[model samples]
Target chain A: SMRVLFVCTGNTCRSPMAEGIFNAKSKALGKDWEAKSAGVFAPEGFPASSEAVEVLKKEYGIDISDHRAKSLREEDLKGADLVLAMAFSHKRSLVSQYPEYADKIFTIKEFVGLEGDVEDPYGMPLEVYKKTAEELSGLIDKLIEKL
Target chain B: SMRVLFVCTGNTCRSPMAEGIFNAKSKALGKDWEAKSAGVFAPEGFPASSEAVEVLKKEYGIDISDHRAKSLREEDLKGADLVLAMAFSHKRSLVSQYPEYADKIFTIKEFVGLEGDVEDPYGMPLEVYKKTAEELSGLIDKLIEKL
Candidate 1:
């Protein structure tokens, strides 16, 4: 089973949503894989935003209500077969921090053949949150197909 | 003239420190260029950290007391020659957000032939701040020579 790690600035938002959506998609497809998400500077015990949870529940039927934020550790990089970041900056940060993992990391948008980043919806309106979630979901779906 | 913008999570911390040190080196060597610092998620009007200013002033005789935090904008990428981020993740985030700037952006450590990152000293002791400033100054000196 391939292990994929999703990374973002904060675990409480983007990465968790990507994790939940990708996990549900993989399980639904009966794929044998391990998926996880973390933040570059995340503090422990930070919960996903309510807006993010609501969108995932309503649109993707995934419940990330219980998700807690996690920081990307050196050990996590050791186990990750592929590490995907929410943006190009995240990928660059990780690789710069852990040069050994440079070859294995990529951005979510890059994975989906998109040239730009996934917009951050933190502190934005519900509509913006929903749009971001939908965009992430669409990208995740395409990522699964590629895997 | 080449323009390089440095970015970190907060303009008050790493990036501003970088800008001060880099700008000092540029001016010291009489290099003709433009360089500025900003934050990826900075609040408006935030000034460079007192610790950052103190350390840079003491160690390198660079006064960043006048530095004001600016958030990254589209115009930052326009007519710029290079965008150097403090960490690999910061660079990835920028390119993901602004794909047009990808080819021109790089991590500070990566740009200056150093491996890994210029560690963040936020909320850390003065010693840590001094150490980080020294690292940035050393890198900036070498970078100036290259320029």
Candidate 2:
């Protein structure tokens, strides 16, 4: 009941950014709430987006260096209390594929009364990616406190 | 100055599809931006015609009149300020292979204000190829406007 999963297209940029910040903050507080990240269509050996790597590495120096891109396996949706998608479309997709898990899935911003998907900065400049990171980090900050 | 260098692995499938659609829309808009293609490591002489081509030409009215295999060179990167890679890593390779033009390169999706790479439709089914082409085409239409 204290687990969460973050999702995006490639699982590299936005999902991991959300997961890293969320998990690190949880652990720092010594909370039982754990989080993981995955991509809906990510390939094997899909590593983190380089854009997010630097921006997030600077966020309390959280340890996502061990993060590798993962695909959404059936087991990932089996019993997790939450499956947070980065975009509205991503949430729609997970529900369409696994209708049984509809109640468990939500776009991160929506659950928290925020608006819109997190900006995806897959292959853009570092500054753009960093801006997205800051946005997600702020969202997670409020999210962690609420949880 | 609006010449865009489209990059793919084989130069016969995804890039040509992107090249064709990009070309068609520019002409439709009566715009002057040009798009061409190259492979990072192309097979010699553009081996066997891609099955993906027939489907795209028929479905989208896109033309592959200038589609051919042309591999990447240092000069190619320097010549145009814009290069659109089909995969995320292609931009990384370009930047690593030529760091000075790091800002000049971007993934096709990102450059168009879209979110992800155009998946390679090399060995997939025709329907999948069509789907990928449709995604690239939608993004390319927007790309032409920006150019």
Candidate 3:
């Protein structure tokens, strides 16, 4: 089995949402891969953003209410076969911090031959969160195809 | 906080035992370090060896029954501040596989200013597991002092 990790500024939003949605699709497609999520600078143990929880379950039927924020650490990076950041800045930061694993780290958009960061939906309306989830879903679909 | 990883052939016995004992002592001494354990060739989710659980609780009052074995991976090594192996061979194997992190990997004995490998107690009697635990405890004590 292989593992991928999604990283964002805070685990409460983009990354966990991607983790849940990605896992659902990855499992459904019978891929031998799993995804996990963490924050670059998050307060540990905080629950996923309420908007994040709502949009995923409502739009995609993915439950991430159990997701808790954790900081991305060395162990998390080494364990992952791929480390996908939600933004270009996150990818750059991780590459700077862990040059040893730079070969496997990329922004989600960049990995799928696109551009731009996954928008952070923290403190955003539920409607915006829904849009973000839709964006992640599309990107994950492309990622699965490449896998 | 800092993290250490204990690695062995089968995480069920030696590494988990070391993780438990090292964490307990590290906590008691007010050190800002924690230990995690993994196996090089372990079936993920296998419970710690029954003898390992028994000896830890009976001899050292540490509980590792909840411990589950997982294989050592690139992520495990990258996340650790130190990667300690139970035997010289395990150290050599890890260094060979992850040379990027070789500077931080050492045998438990070698790290503590001693020489030699910690004996493997897999399939041994309960008494032998107890001895392994004692050996680990001593090495951990030295490790904590240096930290």
Candidate 4:
């Protein structure tokens, strides 16, 4: 079995959406692969962003109500087969924080031969979150392919 | 309705048990009284102590699986008619942080004309938590009387 770890600035916005989308789509792809997510600098136990939660529920019917933000830590990377970062800087941050896992990490876009960061809808409008969620769903399919 | 806010170092142990005991015992005591618990330095969204949860489940038949640590903030005190602190120092710390609430806070024992702080049982064995839960149950009856 292989585990994928999705990462972003905060677990609330981008990574959780990616995690959810990956799991839901990959469910048909099999249980040999699974996904979990975390944040680089998130506070413990905080739920996903309200806007992010709303957009996913409305658009994708994925429930992230139980999702919470977590800081990236060494223990989190234990046994993780892949680390998907939302931005190039996030990959840099994780590599610097957990140098041992550097080889396992990749920016979502970088992994897919694309450029630029995933849309960060942290404090943006509901429409912004919707766009970001749609963007994540489209990329997550390709992410599963790479796995 | 009167709201009783329980305070301790972390909401994981002492005060949540107090909140449960109060809410459960005081159910018939009327809608005039209610209870809540928080921590002086807790980060939001943390669950109750594992030992506390286990003891409550096995012995008291109470489920605090959803209980989380809450930071004691000025806003938390705003709606509380009374603040019951586990220790005198907790009361002192809160008073220092929010002086306007000085008159509203007291040690749980002190509130009932007893003495000393509610002993902290964090990181101890499940037996210690059982003793503390029993200790809290004894006091909660007295607490309901005052309300």
Judging by TM-score against the true structure, name the best candidate. Answer: 3
Q: Which residue pairs collide in model 2, if any?
A: none
lDDT of 3 at B135: 85
| lDDT (tens digit, per residue) of candidate 2 on B26-54 | 66654545677788887757632567667
True contacts kept of each: 0.00, 0.00, 0.00, 0.00
lDDT of 1 by residue, B1-147 (tens): 346788898889888988887776666554545578878888878788899989988887888888888888888877566788888889879877765657778888887776688889999999999889888878876565444
Off by over 4 Å in 4: B1-147
Q: How many backbone clashes are present in model 3?
A: 5
The candidate that wins on DockQ is 3
RMSD of each: 20.3, 19.8, 15.6, 17.7
Best-fitting candidate, measured by lDDT? 3
Q: Give the Å error, residue A139, model 1.
A: 0.7
When candidate 3 is compared with the true two-chain complex, its DockQ is 0.01
True contacts kept of 1: 0.00
Model 2 chain A: weakest 10-residue lDDT segment is A138-147
TM per candidate comes to 0.49, 0.49, 0.51, 0.49
On DockQ, the stronger of 3 and 4 is 3
Residue-wise C-alpha lDDT for candidate 2, range A1-147, written one tens digit per residue: 367889888798888889888887776665546888888998857778766877888755875777798888998887577788999989999999899799888898987778799978967998898788888888887666444
CA displacement after TM-score superposition, residue B32 of candidate 3 (Å): 42
* Model 3 RMSD in angstroms: 15.6
